[PDB]
Automatic annotation (TrEMBL):
This is Peroxidase. The keyword Signal does not apply. Heme b 2 binds at G145, T146, E147, H216, R233, F249. Residues 6-132 form the Dyp-type peroxidase N-terminal domain. Belongs to the DyP-type peroxidase family.
Length: 301
């Protein structure tokens, strides 16, 4: 008489991922059976490839989730708004599939299974293949992950709803960034470090009173009466060397509130200042989703 978290929220250090964002083409009913087949497929792939350490998440946008849940729970869920009057664009879709593991080839098979399960009920808008880069660095050359919640106990505390109808569920935020590395390389390394809030090579935190308020850490390391607004990030680099490349940003949280406060800060809605990273990278997509518990996916009928 308890809830089980979907397998893709908590795993740490996964080297590869696939994110599929899609719109519903017909009756929302199509999503009930598809979702049940998909989580079964995941169990099958986990049995066949135990060394892949595979996890996956199926999550739903506001409109379809309100329909599937009958308006019960997910009190904070809403369509992703535009932040900064447009600095952060909004591309709210109906369905998010997140697959992650130690093996991209296994991820690819799972993605094919997801597409076969939902079939022509969905219109795929984005399919992104994330990869961990050398030293877990972002393509900018700065390490990404250092202050991310560590260990299953703390990641559960931050990401997983503890009780009520939504127990075992989580709110998800996805945002694809396009890096202009040519623009970044025009910046001196000291200026880049002041833009992030950490040193580049050694990845040492620069003190809050030594870095600009526009530094990335000053924008997103937020505390309310001394309590940090934590989130569990699953972001990874993506793209080609000669084409579009950047960071696929992905975060899970028991409360959408923590994510939103960080976006209001970054995009200038809180204090009129914006994130210094906007000097070399920009967000081009944006959406909020609700990841139910595994058992609620099994009560989709
Ligand atoms: C281009 C996009 C982004 C890049 C390249 C980026 C890069 C980084 C880097 C290098 C760090 C420092 C290492 C670490 O502690 O993980 C960091 C920290 C962090 N980022 Fe971002 N980030 C991006 C977007 C975002 C967004 C959109 C959010 C939230 C909405 C976010 C939230 C955070 C948080 C919460 C931390 C930890 C801060 C701390 O407590 O020290 N990031 N990011
Ligand atoms: Mg801190």
């Amino acid at each position: 008489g308890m809830s089980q978290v979907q397998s893709g929220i908590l795993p740490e250090h996964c080297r590869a991922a696939i994110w599929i964002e899609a719109n519903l083409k017909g009756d929302v009913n199509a999503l009930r059976e598809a979702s049940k087949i998909f989580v079964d497929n995941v169990a099958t792939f986990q049995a066949k490839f135990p060394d892949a350490k595979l996890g996956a998440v199926v999550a739903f946008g506001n409109n379809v989730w309100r329909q599937l849940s009958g308006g019960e729970g997910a009190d904070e869920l809403k369509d992703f708004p535009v932040y900064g009057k447009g600095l952060a664009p909004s591309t709210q879709y109906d369905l998010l599939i997140h697959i992650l593991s130690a093996r991209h080839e296994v991820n690819f098979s799972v993605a094919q299974a997801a597409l076969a399960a939902f079939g022509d009920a969905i219109d795929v808008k984005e399919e992104i293949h994330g990869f961990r880069w050398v030293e877990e660095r972002d393509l900018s050359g700065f390490v990404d992950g250092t202050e991310n919640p560590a260990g299953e106990e703390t990641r559960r505390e931050v990401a997983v709803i503890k009780d009520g109808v939504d127990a075992g569920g989580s709110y998800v935020f996805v945002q694809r960034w396009e890096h202009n590395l040519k623009q970044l390389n025009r910046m001196s390394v000291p200026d880049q470090e002041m833009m992030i809030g950490r040193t580049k090579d050694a990845n040492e935190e620069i003190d809050g009173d030594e870095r600009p308020v526009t530094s990335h850490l000053s924008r997103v390391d937020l505390k309310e009466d001394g309590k940090g607004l934590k989130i569990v990030r699953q972001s990874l680099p993506y793209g080609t060397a000669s084409g579009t490349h950047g960071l696929y940003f992905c975060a899970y949280c028991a409360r959408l509130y923590n994510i939103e406060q960080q976006l209001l800060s970054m995009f200038g809605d809180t204090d009129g200042k914006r994130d210094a990273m906007l000097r070399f990278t920009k967000p081009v997509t944006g959406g909020y989703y609700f990841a139910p518990s595994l058992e609620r996916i099994q009560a989709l009928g």
